[PDB]
Design an enzyme around this catalytic site. Structure first.
Site, short mmCIF file in Angstrom:
data_model
loop_
_atom_site.label_atom_id
_atom_site.label_comp_id
_atom_site.label_asym_id
_atom_site.label_seq_id
_atom_site.Cartn_x
_atom_site.Cartn_y
_atom_site.Cartn_z
CG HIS A 1 -1.34 1.24 1.79
ND1 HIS A 1 -1.91 2.26 1.05
CD2 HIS A 1 -1.34 1.67 3.07
CE1 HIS A 1 -2.19 3.27 1.84
NE2 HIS A 1 -1.86 2.94 3.07
CG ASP B 1 7.88 15.36 -28.52
OD1 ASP B 1 7.53 15.22 -27.33
OD2 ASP B 1 8.09 14.40 -29.29
CD1 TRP C 1 7.02 3.91 4.83
CD2 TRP C 1 7.95 4.54 2.90
NE1 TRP C 1 7.39 5.22 4.95
CE2 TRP C 1 7.97 5.63 3.78
CE3 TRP C 1 8.50 4.69 1.63
CZ2 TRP C 1 8.50 6.87 3.42
CZ3 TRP C 1 9.02 5.92 1.28
CH2 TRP C 1 9.02 6.98 2.17
CB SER D 1 12.01 9.27 -10.12
OG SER D 1 10.91 8.45 -9.77
CG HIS E 1 11.81 16.00 4.55
ND1 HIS E 1 10.61 15.97 5.24
CD2 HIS E 1 11.90 17.25 4.03
CE1 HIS E 1 10.03 17.15 5.16
NE2 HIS E 1 10.78 17.94 4.42
CD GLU F 1 9.66 9.96 -2.93
OE1 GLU F 1 10.38 10.47 -3.82
OE2 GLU F 1 8.84 9.07 -3.17
CE1 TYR G 1 8.51 20.11 2.75
CE2 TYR G 1 10.32 18.71 3.42
CZ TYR G 1 9.34 19.62 3.73
OH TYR G 1 9.15 20.05 5.01
CB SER H 1 -0.42 28.33 -8.13
OG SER H 1 0.31 28.33 -6.92
CG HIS I 1 12.35 15.84 10.26
ND1 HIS I 1 12.49 16.89 9.39
CD2 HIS I 1 11.58 14.92 9.63
CE1 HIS I 1 11.85 16.61 8.26
NE2 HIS I 1 11.29 15.42 8.39
CB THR J 1 4.94 25.65 3.78
OG1 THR J 1 6.18 24.98 3.55
CG2 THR J 1 3.83 24.82 3.18
CE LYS K 1 3.67 27.43 -3.24
NZ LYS K 1 4.08 28.53 -4.14
NE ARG L 1 4.58 4.93 11.75
CZ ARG L 1 5.35 5.51 10.83
NH1 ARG L 1 5.11 5.31 9.55
NH2 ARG L 1 6.33 6.31 11.21
C1 HEA Z 1 0.51 8.48 -1.43
C2 HEA Z 1 0.40 8.54 -0.12
C3 HEA Z 1 -0.65 7.80 0.60
C4 HEA Z 1 -2.09 7.91 0.46
C5 HEA Z 1 -2.92 8.77 -0.45
C6 HEA Z 1 -2.56 6.93 1.45
C7 HEA Z 1 -4.00 6.72 1.64
C8 HEA Z 1 -4.64 5.76 2.55
N1 HEA Z 1 -3.91 4.98 3.38
FE1 HEA Z 1 -1.83 4.84 3.65
N2 HEA Z 1 0.25 4.83 3.91
C9 HEA Z 1 1.18 5.49 3.22
C10 HEA Z 1 0.87 6.38 2.10
C11 HEA Z 1 -0.46 6.80 1.66
N3 HEA Z 1 -1.61 6.29 2.15
C12 HEA Z 1 2.58 5.28 3.65
C13 HEA Z 1 3.83 5.89 3.10
C14 HEA Z 1 2.45 4.35 4.76
C15 HEA Z 1 3.57 3.83 5.63
C16 HEA Z 1 3.73 2.33 5.78
C17 HEA Z 1 4.65 2.14 6.96
O1 HEA Z 1 4.69 3.03 7.83
O2 HEA Z 1 5.34 1.11 7.02
C18 HEA Z 1 0.99 4.17 4.83
C19 HEA Z 1 0.36 3.30 5.80
C20 HEA Z 1 -1.06 3.27 6.03
C21 HEA Z 1 -1.61 3.08 7.38
C22 HEA Z 1 -0.86 2.91 8.67
C23 HEA Z 1 -0.93 1.43 9.00
C24 HEA Z 1 0.13 1.07 9.99
O3 HEA Z 1 1.31 1.29 9.69
O4 HEA Z 1 -0.23 0.55 11.07
C25 HEA Z 1 -3.05 3.07 7.15
C26 HEA Z 1 -4.05 2.92 8.23
O5 HEA Z 1 -5.24 2.88 8.00
C27 HEA Z 1 -3.27 3.29 5.71
C28 HEA Z 1 -4.55 3.30 5.02
C29 HEA Z 1 -4.86 4.30 4.02
C30 HEA Z 1 -6.24 4.57 3.65
C31 HEA Z 1 -7.49 3.95 4.16
C32 HEA Z 1 -6.11 5.58 2.62
C33 HEA Z 1 -7.26 6.22 1.96
O6 HEA Z 1 -7.04 7.64 1.89
C34 HEA Z 1 -7.57 5.67 0.58
C35 HEA Z 1 -8.50 6.68 -0.06
C36 HEA Z 1 -7.71 7.30 -1.17
C37 HEA Z 1 -8.16 7.37 -2.42
C38 HEA Z 1 -9.53 6.86 -2.75
C39 HEA Z 1 -7.24 7.99 -3.44
C40 HEA Z 1 -7.94 8.19 -4.77
C41 HEA Z 1 -7.49 7.10 -5.70
C42 HEA Z 1 -6.81 7.37 -6.81
C43 HEA Z 1 -6.41 6.24 -7.70
C44 HEA Z 1 -6.46 8.79 -7.17
C45 HEA Z 1 -7.25 9.08 -8.43
C46 HEA Z 1 -6.94 10.43 -9.01
C47 HEA Z 1 -6.29 10.56 -10.16
C48 HEA Z 1 -5.81 9.35 -10.90
C49 HEA Z 1 -6.01 11.91 -10.72
N4 HEA Z 1 -2.03 3.37 4.94
C1 HEA Z 2 3.19 15.23 1.61
C2 HEA Z 2 4.43 15.08 2.02
C3 HEA Z 2 4.85 15.63 3.32
C4 HEA Z 2 4.92 17.03 3.66
C5 HEA Z 2 4.61 18.24 2.84
C6 HEA Z 2 5.36 16.96 5.06
C7 HEA Z 2 5.57 18.19 5.80
C8 HEA Z 2 6.12 18.36 7.13
N1 HEA Z 2 6.41 17.32 7.93
FE1 HEA Z 2 6.19 15.26 7.52
N2 HEA Z 2 6.07 13.23 7.01
C9 HEA Z 2 5.74 12.68 5.83
C10 HEA Z 2 5.35 13.46 4.65
C11 HEA Z 2 5.26 14.91 4.56
N3 HEA Z 2 5.57 15.73 5.58
C12 HEA Z 2 5.80 11.20 5.77
C13 HEA Z 2 5.45 10.29 4.62
C14 HEA Z 2 6.20 10.85 7.13
C15 HEA Z 2 6.39 9.50 7.76
C16 HEA Z 2 7.60 8.80 7.20
C17 HEA Z 2 7.74 7.47 7.86
O1 HEA Z 2 7.48 7.39 9.08
O2 HEA Z 2 8.08 6.50 7.16
C18 HEA Z 2 6.34 12.16 7.76
C19 HEA Z 2 6.73 12.28 9.15
C20 HEA Z 2 7.23 13.52 9.71
C21 HEA Z 2 8.23 13.53 10.79
C22 HEA Z 2 8.95 12.37 11.39
C23 HEA Z 2 8.28 12.06 12.72
C24 HEA Z 2 8.67 10.67 13.12
O3 HEA Z 2 8.84 9.81 12.23
O4 HEA Z 2 8.80 10.42 14.33
C25 HEA Z 2 8.38 14.95 11.08
C26 HEA Z 2 9.33 15.48 12.08
O5 HEA Z 2 9.77 16.62 12.02
C27 HEA Z 2 7.48 15.71 10.18
C28 HEA Z 2 7.31 17.16 10.19
C29 HEA Z 2 6.88 17.92 9.02
C30 HEA Z 2 6.91 19.40 8.99
C31 HEA Z 2 7.37 20.39 10.01
C32 HEA Z 2 6.38 19.71 7.67
C33 HEA Z 2 6.20 21.05 7.07
O6 HEA Z 2 6.80 21.08 5.78
C34 HEA Z 2 4.74 21.46 6.96
C35 HEA Z 2 4.65 22.90 6.47
C36 HEA Z 2 3.22 23.40 6.52
C37 HEA Z 2 2.79 24.20 7.50
C38 HEA Z 2 3.70 24.59 8.61
C39 HEA Z 2 1.36 24.69 7.53
C40 HEA Z 2 1.10 25.87 6.61
C41 HEA Z 2 1.64 27.13 7.22
C42 HEA Z 2 0.89 28.04 7.85
C43 HEA Z 2 -0.59 27.86 7.98
C44 HEA Z 2 1.56 29.26 8.41
C45 HEA Z 2 1.48 29.29 9.93
C46 HEA Z 2 2.31 28.17 10.50
C47 HEA Z 2 3.21 28.39 11.47
C48 HEA Z 2 3.44 29.76 12.03
C49 HEA Z 2 4.00 27.23 12.00
N4 HEA Z 2 6.64 14.82 9.38
CU LIG Z 3 10.22 14.50 6.74
#
Ligand code: HEA
Ligand code: HEA
Ligand SMILES: [Cu+2]
Ligand SMILES: CCCCCCCCCCCCCCCC(=O)OC[C@H](COP(=O)([O-])OCC[N+](C)(C)C)OC(=O)CCCCCCCCCCCCCCC
Ligand SMILES: CCCCCCCCCCCCCCCC(=O)OC[C@H](COP(=O)(O)OCCN)OC(=O)CCCCCCCCCCCCCCC
Ligand SMILES: CCCCCCCCCCCCCCCC(=O)OC[C@H](COP(=O)(O)OCCN)OC(=O)CCCCCCCCCCCCCCC
Ligand SMILES: CCCCCCCCCCCCCCCC(=O)OC[C@H](COP(=O)(O)OCCN)OC(=O)CCCCCCCCCCCCCCC
Ligand SMILES: CCCCCCCCCCCCCCCC(=O)OC[C@H](COP(=O)(O)OCCN)OC(=O)CCCCCCCCCCCCCCC
Ligand SMILES: CCCCCCCCCCCCCCCC(=O)OC[C@H](COP(=O)(O)OCCN)OC(=O)CCCCCCCCCCCCCCC
Ligand SMILES: CCCCCCCCCCCCCCCC(=O)OC[C@H](COP(=O)(O)OCCN)OC(=O)CCCCCCCCCCCCCCC
Ligand SMILES: CCCCCCCCCCCCCCCC(=O)OC[C@H](COP(=O)(O)OCCN)OC(=O)CCCCCCCCCCCCCCC
Ligand SMILES: CCCCCCCCCCCCCCCC(=O)OC[C@H](COP(=O)(O)OCCN)OC(=O)CCCCCCCCCCCCCCC
Ligand code: CUA
Ligand code: CUA
Ligand SMILES: [Ca+2]
Ligand SMILES: [Mg+2]
Lengths: 59, 47, 102, 534, 77, 269, 236, 45, 66, 55
Positions: free
Chosen positions: D62, D92, D127, D158, D241, D243, D245, D256, D290, D316, D319, D438
């Protein structure tokens, strides 16, 4: 040997795909196609034994 | 190179001029996409 | 650079005087009203003249309808449409609310 | 038709193939997510009879499917290869055979991922593929090797698409286009291409070191041998990380555009948006540790990394506030891309604020590997990528397909995925802050209530997906009919409040981008003469 | 004894103590072959490595010492 | 020219590539490579000849791809100034990607050396591993790589100036110089004290120097095909991208070997 | 101490670390709620004020004043929430003369507790493994997947140093009521310091993926009084 | 100047509905699990 | 156009009711409950926790079931 | 005549900004001074009773 002008004439004056326009194209292209078909048929063929558990016998 | 263009020439599949219905292929594609993990679960649970 | 209000007034007077067909009258009026200010009544007077010159009624009703949706109160709309009473009487355009009475 | 799709060398056919493989694999990832959430509905082994290995295997399937095979192919591949040559006026894209080999190296990554799932035990490592759990002493069999090869093939895709995108938008712009006069989606995919190019080497290095430990008896990560497993965490998160972003920044491009075209006013400070996207892209590579506040880093190292992670809240925020400034004062035409933009704004701000609470290394004591981090990341990933994807689809699909979609069904699909995604991802913060770990197939039975309401939400999300793939069928068979009756929205921009209808009909598309003046489905090679610009 | 232990060692002030336990074991074995005159100050490193190192690590390093495989700075001289 | 005659051409410089099968052919070869090696690592195939065949198919598909691109650049003349600028920047970005892979390997080395593990013995190199001495063989290696750089830039400027026999002799000499590097590297791997399985020192040492060895074998192939294309008049005086590509690859590999030499030997010992 | 059904907060504190990080979490959630209220109010008032605006102000583009204001406003918000995070991080990172050191080495799907400073008969170390009670062996009243075979019992109001390492894979040592989460890489030791302010039972789990038995791997720390602890230790 | 009612009046009459509507919308969007806990058995009802 | 707002409200209500109906169906085709999901088991769990006086200012009672 | 009426959007923006900051401050003032202070008062009451029964 400076075949560049002559090969420019042959390559631009040709209604064939670009990998076929040289006169020596079949000489590469037929064994490559056979060897490619074998090399992509066989590891796909070894997937049922992979998901079944049957490792290869050491004979 | 010059291919055909228009409303349905942009896509790989064939929608309009068709012997079978389009809904057959269009939902069979997403159905095998949805049923790949069930094949995986069946194999792993049979093991 | 930011324009003062009278500089805006002079510029849109010149623009409405130079407009020459219906696309230009509607364009000048669109980016006339898309600022953060209700235009001065000389600008609306030039807008009604310029919509008359291109022989199109309903944009000269749209002047007052956009003025209604643009101005902030219900009283400043009255202050505008009584200060343009003689111009609207001379051209003979209606308001939209006295055109569709409901 | 063998040539046009198999031997393909123009960008749009590659783009619709990228989108088809993306949505196929996204359907599969949603099915794995449904099965995960179904097993996690009530405590005790409900559906998978014991067998926590299969649950972990479906977890990595998943995760890797939704990241590397839905969002990255869809956002990068399909939308880049359709609009990035188009929105700059390029004929192209340069190296189109690299553009074709990237797509065609993707679905065999899917093939070997599926066969990793089918062979002897399956990859049950998460993952992140952390050793020594993913090593040969804990995971015998060829499965994690095939998952590694899936990651390698999609890494090739990629990186090669990133090279293609960089030289396309650098070398092949149209004649009036300076780099400052570019659109925000083109700038977004440019910055994303640079982060791909500078991130995927470290992923390939760490993954090939994992493979070398597994099959060639070497010790990069084996403690019996002197190796250190934290080296894999450093390498994988220096990829990881950047990735995430990479996954979010094309969403920042799409939003936008849909916000500026459905508020009928341009983006507030567009050069500041370019600077903010580039600042986020530069600031990604400095915050990678982090994700590992727990391993025992020094106090000065964690005190650095919490500040570095917190610094990215500023661009962010710039933005997210400039999007509010674009929507303020405009004339909102609430079509479904505008609905997905507004919902993206609110729900991505919520996910970012939970991420800011996660940025602190003293609080990530309390939140690491809880369901709080899956609340954070499923919020930013799910909303900021799936809502961006749906906004891009409902925004550009009438133009790139010529077939309008049913609008009432589109708004019920939006609303269903909105409340369903909220219902699934909001109680995860409660489960996490109360200490639910988790990646568990079973829990103490004090977590069952929020697990039940989230498992109720999953069926709503899957129903919205089934509805969406019905909207696809209804678009493909009745698109011209949808144009001729009133079942859709023909004009994305209404007339302004002075503009006559015939004056509109002579000028029916008013965009700041090229793609909307192209014909429905566009020419197989458009831009015979190059598109001029002042 | 009512709850005494090693305390705070300034040579390893950070979180991981893997070189603390290792250097204490190596220094306890170095006190035996080199100096051998201060058996109660030899027991300080004994209590420190005994409190910090796990029993599996102590058994493994003891077997590597008795078989010569031990990679520590051990000079019998 | 006229307007009728200007109407018959591209109107934009960039290359409109014909459809070609080599993307999906290289992709199928890469899938069969990954599958066959994952099935031969764990004993599901008996022997290595399947992986050998998959590597052979991947190589011949890549060679046919390069045959098509030299055909389009030479005989079809599709590479104008914009396409040449584009492929130059594309090769530069791929070179940056390889440099970043080597930065990852240097990170692995610097971690495992700056944090010496207690099972190794808290010293770098570990106890029992006698390191490769810097001054004996790798000094010869690094000076013939530096002279390879001098020889490619001499041969490239002899190509620009028009002199054929100087540029051909320069490219031949530098190709034999880098295969002397490859042979000395194989000799060093043959008579070396430790293995790749001999802990993390052997691990990251043979990883870094073997990846650089692989890139120098790739540069051997590129210098060979560039010698062939210069011999059979493919390279002009002002139009050559294979040569500029191969010499910037030569210099980047030289800088990577300089860093590899100084760190892995003068700081490793 | 034990998770609660339909809960929404942390478990109850037992140590200065957990109450420190709870205070820090609420001090962060304060300003997170002011900016969440700002963004949600702004979005709501914008859509419900301008979904029915006919003329769009298409000449509002640059606006440098609010640009510099919304650039320097998150700066001071992150500064304000990064003051107590630094104070808490540099406070809880200190180890100041522990009265006790216990190892918790995490083997593949169980724990091994080791009171290596202490005695059982005369001087020899105390150690015991702590398996989960299986679901077939639960007598009536035990919590499922949380009540283990042998609990790690620990004296109250005294500094404890936990030196956690592993044996096979990475296993995390996590008790969230004690505010401790520190993982066990098999290469190195990792210490943490906690003092417990009250008696009772505190539960946790392996917070890292450990294979098939990652779920059933609980931690049970029983904080008892000091004569009761010394009685348990001389009994053990 | 200042024709008509003051800006305080004519924007308070727009804002005071919107404050209550926003509070309702956010209290639904954030406080919906209170209904599930309210009807739930863990309230002992 | 004038009926679509009611149609999208009725559509999203139909989606919610249909999805919880499907949840009830595939929940009914599930495994048995845990043996610890009883009122009387959870009362004894509360009894044990009260003897250990866990969660003193919060809630310690796990009841949650019937 | 008509006095120049200009700048309604600027007054509207600063009014919306300070109303949003005050609304979020009301939310957060409720959060802290009700919820966090209630939890801290319960914990301090428990530790006061605990020290009293320790006397
Ligand atoms: C792309 C990022 C992404 C998205 C969208 C989701 C979406 C969902 N995920 Fe997941 N998930 C992960 C990335 C994501 N996940 C990752 C990285 C882990 C970590 C595994 C680990 O920690 O080991 C994780 C793990 C994870 C957990 C934590 C389980 C655990 O570790 O104990 C759960 C729990 O319910 C979960 C369930 C779901 C469900 C129910 C949705 C629902 O939101 C599903 C509903 C979403 C849709 C219906 C999307 C629409 C479908 C499309 C096909 C898009 C169509 C549009 C176009 C083609 C333009 N996934
Ligand atoms: C969609 C991709 C995506 C994005 C954009 C982010 C954005 C951010 N993430 Fe995250 N993150 C993940 C995907 C993402 N993350 C994934 C997949 C994991 C789990 C990986 C794994 O466990 O395997 C993870 C886990 C993760 C961790 C690790 C925690 C842990 O594993 O124990 C941390 C720690 O710092 C973190 C923090 C942040 C912060 C600070 C931002 C910031 O960039 C967010 C910026 C946005 C805002 C701040 C809000 C908008 C701003 C405002 C409204 C202005 C006002 C705000 C302030 C004044 C603060 N996230
Ligand atoms: Cu991160
Ligand atoms: C189509 C109509 C189908 C109607 C089926 C009627 C039967 C029924 O009432 O089911 C109740 C379900 C059972 O679900 P359960 O309580 O998890 O039991 C599952 C079965 N076991 C595990 C015991 C084997 O319990 C539930 O699913 C609860 C319903 C979901 C909650 C909806 C709340 C809506 C609030 C607004
Ligand atoms: C699956 C059942 C097929 C039955 C065929 C029966 C044949 C009898 C004759 C019937 C008429 C001919 C049928 C063949 C034609 C055909 O259907 O296309 C065949 C292909 C695959 O074919 P295959 O190689 O699997 O077929 C084996 C035999 N040759 O299908 C499909 O791609 C289905 C694709 C599903 C639709 C996807 C919808 C989403 C698209 C989004 C695009 C927009 C992107 C916008 C963003 C960039
Ligand atoms: C590893 C990936 C290596 C990428 C190198 C790209 C070089 C820059 C470039 O763009 O080289 C240009 C060519 C593509 O040119 P084209 O024919 O598409 O361009 C048409 C206009 N000239 O690259 C290649 O032949 C790559 C060949 C890949 C061989 C298989 C690799 C599998 C691993
Ligand atoms: C910390 C405060 C900021 C937080 C972030 C901002 C909120 C995000 C949403 C923004 C939406 C509106 C943006 C578009 C508006 C626009 O673009 O307006 C453009 C106009 C143009 O003005 P001009 O023609 O005179 O100049 C033309 C040449 N520049 O400039 C303005 O209106 C100025 C507005 C000033 C705002 C001051 C804010 C004062 C309150 C601060 C906080 C106080 C809290 C007190 C609590 C008790
Ligand atoms: C938003 C709309 C969709 C939200 C789905 C909520 C799921 C209901 C649930 O999660 O139901 C769990 C609860 C408690 O049931 P229980 O603990 O006895 O469960 C034991 C096995 N059944 O049932 C209810 O209280 C139903 C009433 C919930 C009201 C929700 C209203 C939201 C507005
Ligand atoms: C995708 C891109 C991945 C990029 C990152 C790759 C990092 C790893 C580089 C591997 C070099 C290994 C080497 O060169 O190994 C050299 C050793 C030398 O033997 P020895 O000196 O120990 O002999 C002892 C006496 N001296 O051969 C071996 O023993 C076998 C090594 C494993 C088998 C070959 C593995 C090939 C993988 C290549 C992947 C290339 C891509
Ligand atoms: C694997 C084996 C790698 C072997 C590489 C041989 C490259 C020769 C291709 C060539 O020679 O391409 C010739 C063209 C241009 O030729 P030109 O304009 O100078 O022709 C002059 C006509 N008068 O160069 C390019 O487009 C760029 C070359 C990039 C090559 C990168 C290879 C990456 C491979 C990944 C592994
Ligand atoms: C933000 C505000 C969220 C409010 C949710 C309402 C909960 C309704 C309910 O279901 O709460 C039920 C519980 C009562 O349960 P109990 O412990 O009495 O059970 C005893 C059974 N024997 O209420 C509470 O504990 C108070 C909840 C306060 C909210 C704390 C939020 C901290 C985590 C933040 C989550 C992420 C936020 C996103 C970013 C801002
Ligand atoms: C569970 C947690 C989430 C709960 C969410 C709220 C609960 C309700 C769920 C949805 C019920 C369906 C109602 C359909 C409404 C309808 O039918 O819309 C029809 C309306 C009116 O149309 P009209 O005036 O033109 O005339 C029609 C009559 N002739 O147009 C609209 O669309 C505008 C309303 C939607 C505004 C955009 C919202 C986008 C998402 C916002 C995300 C959150 C941001 C705010 C945060 C504070
Ligand atoms: Cu574990
Ligand atoms: Cu675990
Ligand atoms: Ca379960
Ligand atoms: Mg972890």
């Amino acid at each position: 040997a400076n075949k560049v002008i002559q090969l420019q004439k042959i390559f631009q004056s040709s209604t064939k795909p670009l990998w076929w326009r040289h006169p020596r194209s079949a000489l590469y292209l037929y064994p490559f196609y056979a060897i490619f078909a074998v090399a992509v048929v066989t590891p796909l063929l070894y997937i049922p034994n992979a998901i079944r558990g049957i490792k290869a016998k050491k004979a | 190179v010059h291919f055909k263009d228009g409303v349905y020439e942009n896509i790989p599949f064939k929608v309009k001029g068709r012997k079978t219905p389009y809904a057959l292929s269009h939902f069979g594609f997403f159905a095998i996409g949805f049923a790949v993990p069930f094949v995986a679960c069946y194999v792993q649970l049979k093991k | 650079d930011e324009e003062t209000f009278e500089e805006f007034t002079a510029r849109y007077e010149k623009e409405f005087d130079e407009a020459y067909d219906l696309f230009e009258v509607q364009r000048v009026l669109n980016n006339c009203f898309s600022y953060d200010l209700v235009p001065a009544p000389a600008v609306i007077e030039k807008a009604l003249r310029a919509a008359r010159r291109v022989n199109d009624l309903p944009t000269a009703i749209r002047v007052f309808e956009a003025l209604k949706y643009k101005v902030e109160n219900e009283d400043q709309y009255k202050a505008y449409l009584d200060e343009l009473k003689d111009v609207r009487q001379e051209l003979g355009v209606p308001l939209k609310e006295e055109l569709f009475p409901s | 038709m063998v040539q046009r799709w198999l031997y393909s060398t123009n960008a749009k056919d590659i783009a619709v193939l990228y989108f088809m493989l993306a949505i196929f694999s996204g359907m599969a990832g949603t099915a794995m997510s449904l099965i995960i959430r179904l097993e996690l509905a009530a405590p005790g082994s409900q559906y998978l009879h014991g067998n926590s290995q299969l649950f972990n295997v479906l977890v990595v399937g998943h995760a890797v499917l939704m990241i590397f095979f839905l969002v990255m192919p869809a956002l990068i591949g399909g939308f880049g290869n359709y609009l990035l040559p188009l929105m700059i006026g390029a004929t192209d894209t340069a190296f189109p055979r690299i553009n074709n080999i990237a797509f065609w190296v993707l679905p065999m990554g899917l093939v070997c991922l599926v066969t990793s799932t089918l062979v002897e035990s399956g990859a049950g490592t998460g993952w992140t593929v952390y050793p020594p759990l993913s090593s040969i002493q804990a995971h015998s069999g060829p499965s994690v090797d095939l998952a590694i090869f899936a990651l390698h093939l999609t890494s090739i895709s990629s990186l090669l698409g990133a090279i293609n995108f960089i030289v396309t938008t650098l070398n092949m712009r149209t004649n009036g286009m300076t780099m400052h006069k570019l659109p925000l989606f083109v700038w977004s995919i440019f910055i994303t291409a640079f982060l791909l190019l500078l991130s995927l080497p470290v992923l390939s290095a760490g993954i090939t070191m994992l493979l070398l430990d597994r099959n060639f008896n070497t010790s990069f990560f084996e403690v019996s041998g002197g190796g250190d497993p934290i080296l894999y965490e450093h390498l994988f998160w220096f990829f990881g990380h950047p990735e995430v972003y990479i996954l979010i920044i094309p969403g920042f491009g799409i939003i936008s555009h849909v916000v500026s075209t459905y508020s009928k006013k341009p983006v507030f400070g567009e050069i500041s948006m370019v600077y903010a996207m580039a600042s986020i892209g530069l600031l990604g590579f400095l915050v990678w540790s982090h994700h590992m506040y727990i391993v025992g880093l020094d106090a000065d190292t964690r005190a650095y990394f919490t500040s570095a992670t917190m610094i990215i809240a500023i661009p962010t925020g710039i933005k997210i506030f400039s999007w509010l400034a674009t929507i303020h004062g405009g004339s909102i035409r609430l079509a479904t891309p505008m609905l997905y933009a507004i919902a993206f704004l609110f729900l991505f701000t919520m996910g970012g604020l939970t991420g800011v609470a996660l940025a602190n290394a003293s609080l990530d004591v309390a939140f690491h590997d809880t369901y709080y981090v899956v609340g954070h990341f499923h919020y930013v990933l799910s909303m900021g990528a799936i809502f961006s994807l749906f906004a891009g689809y409902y925004y550009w699909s009438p133009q790139i397909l010529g077939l309008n979609y049913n609008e009432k069904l589109a708004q019920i699909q939006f609303w269903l995925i909105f409340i369903g995604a909220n219902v699934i991802f909001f109680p995860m913060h409660f489960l996490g802050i109360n200490g639910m770990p988790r990646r568990i197939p079973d829990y103490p039975d004090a977590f069952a209530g929020w697990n039940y309401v989230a498992s109720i939400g999953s069926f709503i999300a899957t129903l919205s997906l089934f509805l969406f793939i019905y909207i696809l069928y209804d678009q493909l068979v009745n698109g011209l009919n949808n144009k001729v009756n009133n079942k859709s929205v023909i004009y994305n921009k209404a007339p302004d409040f002075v503009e006559s209808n015939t004056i509109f009909n002579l000028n029916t598309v008013k965009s700041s981008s090229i793609e909307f003046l192209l014909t429905s489905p566009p020419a197989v090679h458009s831009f015979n003469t190059p598109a001029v610009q002042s | 004894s009512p709850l005494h232990t090693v305390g705070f060692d300034a040579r390893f002030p950070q979180q991981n103590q893997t070189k603390h336990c290792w250097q204490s074991y190596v220094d306890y074995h170095k006190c035996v072959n080199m100096k051998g005159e201060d058996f109660a100050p030899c027991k300080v490193f004994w209590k420190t490595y005994n409190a910090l190192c796990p029993l599996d690590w102590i058994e493994k390093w003891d077997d590597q010492r008795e078989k010569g495989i031990f990679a520590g700075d051990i000079n019998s001289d | 020219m006229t307007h009728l005659e200007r109407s018959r051409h591209q109107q934009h410089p960039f290359h409109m590539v014909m459809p070609s099968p080599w993307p999906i052919v290289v992709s199928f070869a890469l899938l069969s490579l990954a599958l066959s090696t994952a099935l031969t690592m764990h004993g599901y195939i008996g022997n290595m000849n399947m992986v050998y065949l998959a590597l052979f198919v991947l190589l011949t598909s890549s060679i046919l791809w390069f045959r098509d691109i030299v055909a389009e650049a030479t005989y079809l003349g599709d590479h104008t100034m914009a396409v040449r600028k584009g492929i130059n920047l594309g090769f530069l970005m791929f070179v940056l990607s390889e440099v970043l892979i080597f930065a990852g390997l240097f990170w692995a080395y610097f971690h495992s050396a700056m944090s010496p593990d207690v099972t190794l013995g808290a010293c770098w190199p570990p106890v029992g591993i006698e390191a490769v001495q810097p001054t004996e063989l790798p000094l010869l290696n690094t000076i013939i790589l530096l002279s390879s750089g001098a020889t490619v830039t001499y041969s490239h400027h002899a190509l620009i100036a028009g002199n054929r026999n100087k540029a051909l002799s320069g490219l031949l000499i530098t190709f034999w110089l880098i295969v002397i590097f490859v042979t000395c590297q194989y000799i060093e791997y043959t008579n070396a004290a430790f293995t790749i399985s001999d802990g993390v020192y052997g691990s990251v040492f043979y990883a870094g120097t073997g990846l650089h060895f692989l890139h120098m074998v790739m540069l051997a192939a590129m210098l060979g095909v560039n010698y062939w294309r210069m011999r059979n008049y493919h390279l002009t005086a002002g139009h050559h991208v294979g040569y500029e590509t191969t010499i910037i690859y030569t210099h980047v590999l030289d800088v990577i070997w300089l860093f590899l030499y100084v760190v892995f030997y003068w700081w490793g010992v | 101490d034990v998770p609660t059904p339909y809960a929404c907060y942390f478990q109850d504190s037992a140590t200065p670390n957990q109450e420190g990080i709870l205070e820090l979490h609420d001090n962060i959630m304060f300003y997170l709620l002011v900016i969440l209220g700002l963004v949600s109010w702004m979005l709501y008032t914008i859509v419900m004020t301008y979904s029915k605006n006919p003329i769009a102000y298409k000449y509002i583009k640059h606006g440098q004043t609010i640009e510099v204001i919304w650039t320097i406003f998150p700066a001071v918000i992150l500064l304000i929430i990064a003051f107590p995070s630094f104070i808490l991080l540099y406070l809880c990172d200190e180890v100041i003369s522990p009265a006790m050191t216990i190892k918790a080495i995490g083997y593949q799907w169980y724990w091994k507790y080791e009171y290596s400073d202490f005695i059982n008969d005369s001087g020899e170390t105390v150690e015991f493994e702590s398996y989960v009670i299986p679901d077939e062996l639960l007598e009536e009243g035990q919590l499922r997947l949380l009540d283990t075979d042998t609990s790690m019992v620990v004296p109250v109001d005294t500094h404890i140093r936990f030196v956690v390492t592993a044996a096979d894979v990475i296993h995390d040592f996590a008790i969230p009521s004690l505010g401790i989460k520190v993982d066990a890489t098999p290469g190195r030791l990792n210490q943490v310091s906690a003092l417990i302010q009250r008696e009772g039972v505190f539960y946790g789990a392996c917070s890292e993926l450990c294979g098939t038995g990652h779920a059933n791997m609980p931690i049970k720390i029983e904080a008892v009084s000091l004569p009761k602890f010394l009685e348990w230790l001389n009994e053990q | 100047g200042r024709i008509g009612e003051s800006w305080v009046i004519t924007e308070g009459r727009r804002l005071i509905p919107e404050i209550f509507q926003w509070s309702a919308v956010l209290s639904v969007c954030l406080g919906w699990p209170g209904a599930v806990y309210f009807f739930s058995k863990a309230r002992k009802a | 156009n004038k009926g679509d707002s009611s149609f999208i409200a009725k559509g999203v209500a139909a989606g919610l009711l249909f999805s919880v109906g499907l949840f009830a169906v595939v929940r009914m085709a599930g495994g048995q409950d845990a043996k610890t999901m009883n009122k009387e088991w959870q009362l004894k769990s509360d009894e044990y926790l009260k003897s250990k006086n866990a969660n003193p200012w919060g809630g310690y009672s796990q009841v949650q079931s019937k | 005549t008509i006095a120049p009426i200009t700048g309604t959007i600027k007054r509207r923006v600063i009014m919306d900004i300070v109303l949003g900051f005050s609304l979020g401050g009301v939310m957060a003032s409720y959060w802290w001074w009700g919820f966090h202070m209630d939890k801290i008062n319960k914990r301090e009451k428990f530790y006061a009773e605990l020290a009293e029964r320790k006397k």
